[PDB]
Symmetry: none
Subunit: 141 residues, 4 copies
């Protein structure tokens, strides 16, 4: 059974991580190949580290703060956060986190699903830029 | 360190299913909540069935056949396919399958990951159509 | 030539061009270029000697017509986006700019209006806004 | 009257020029205030020059050549061309030219209509760029 759920995660293209919520600083104890391709970091450089290493220059500190609180309160969270690949390229990370609890209700882990939506959001920005330039002229008219 | 993967799959929004390659006609033995939302079918109405119940008259037979061949040859595949929700609502399904083999190298299951990319397909079509409209404001 | 050249210039404008007589009652159209004929679908016979309001229809924004009328009576220029209708009853968005025409004594004699169908650009916007619905949710 | 057309041309925001097809190098004999505002050149720096002075490094040679042909063949033409204002600021010129013949059928002038369509173009460019992006996704 379990073998097959692992292989399901291994098959997913989105980044999947599991962090240990009973160790200090919620270290990554698993990542899938999709996380390697998404971030540019091999697993050897991922395991045992907090995910915050993905953050960079323009990452929004408010979003990081909202994420921090969710985790410390053992709650799910779904944010869009600016992250950076190992090569320094920025990417927009549609990030979802969910707590894992055992039969006693003890928080043991977090799961995290990371999806690159750079292309999608970049297309919005350009479309909205073209469209704002138009509606501004219709405002004068 | 086994149920943690299950939970990870449970939280995946994209549809995830597992079919049993040993049982006849590859019955679905698992689907996450993501699949229930995608298809409109509660898991109780999904389990035990072949995924072809998502197909309908407008599904491209060439895509289906190509997929059938990959599965009979125990190979991975990736296809864009028209599916139907329980309510008949059509959608574009970005379907990727992967074989699962035990340590003996026997094929025991397929993993299926389905994403509704309807909005993405429409987005391109709409943006292309808009482009033409705007290009029409300038002769040449 | 001299006068005639400018005539061919005005005829070269693909954009609709009308000259209205600002002395005659009801500011009638005295001239319209071929571009205006193509835009509206009205031949020059069915245009010349009519007020341009014949282009307006059920959904035409009364506010826009009001701002447009004000400037005219005040011999001032104006630029508006207005819904008009073609002879075949087809609606179109009219990017309309009008300018007053004064003689050597500075007396308002005519108006000059330039019409451009921007229906395509509006349509494109509609298509983009529709494509953004998905993301916006 | 036909004196109307002239004063009308003087109001239009769009550029209007007349060139003499008989004189050497098709000089501009007339430009409206719109042409002055569009190009940023006072009419004294316009009249008696060929319109090519608006062209610059990024101007497409194929378009220029296509235009040159039509002018020598005494035909109409309609092109979209990159021009430069006096300040060195580029703009997209929708250029519509027509030949003016006399009663003999002899070519005497050209009428030029210049419209700044930069915004329209820049709109198309942003969409094309957005489409590259959204295509990646699929
Ligand atoms: C399962 C999981 C996955 C995470 N994935 C990411 C991620 O991909 N990118 C990111 O910037 N932060 C991610 N985080 C959040 C950070 O690891 C961290 O909790 C956050 O930056 C709080 O900052 P601080 O604790 O250093 O103040 C993830 C957290 C968890 C629990
Ligand atoms: C794991 C897995 C997931 C599948 N998911 C879908 C799906 O979401 N939609 C679909 O139309 N077919 C899906 N299929 C394909 C059908 O189950 C079936 O294999 C296909 O139609 C083969 O052709 P046949 O129906 O003629 O045998 C999936 C197959 C597997 C093994
Ligand atoms: C030069 C000129 C061009 C005009 N072109 C248009 C036009 O293309 N479409 C339109 O609906 N109204 C146009 N108008 C406005 C109408 O002719 C009219 O002045 C306006 O609707 C004023 O309100 P009324 O029609 O109720 O008097 C134009 C006016 C002028 C002076
Ligand atoms: C009426 C008229 C208007 C023109 N307006 C422009 C213009 O606005 N911008 C431009 O770059 N060229 C314009 N041209 C083109 C040039 O004047 C010239 O014909 C062309 O560049 C020929 O190539 P040459 O420069 O190698 O002689 C115009 C030509 C005519 C006849």
């Amino acid at each position: 059974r379990d073998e097959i759920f692992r292989i399901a995660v291994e098959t997913i293209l989105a980044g999947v991580v599991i962090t240990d919520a009973q160790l200090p600083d919620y270290p990554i104890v698993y990542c899938n190949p999709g996380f390697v391709q998404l971030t540019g970091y091999p697993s050897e450089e991922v395991l045992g580290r907090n995910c915050r290493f993905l953050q960079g220059p323009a990452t929004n500190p408010e979003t990081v703060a909202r994420l921090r609180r969710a985790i410390h309160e053992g709650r799910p969270a779904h944010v869009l956060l600016l992250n950076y690949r190992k090569d320094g390229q920025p990417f927009w990370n549609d990030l979802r986190i969910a707590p894992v609890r055992d039969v006693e209700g003890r928080l043991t882990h977090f799961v995290g699903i990371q999806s690159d939506v750079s292309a999608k959001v970049e297309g919005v920005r350009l479309l909205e830029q073209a469209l704002e330039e138009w509606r501004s002229t219709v405002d004068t008219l």
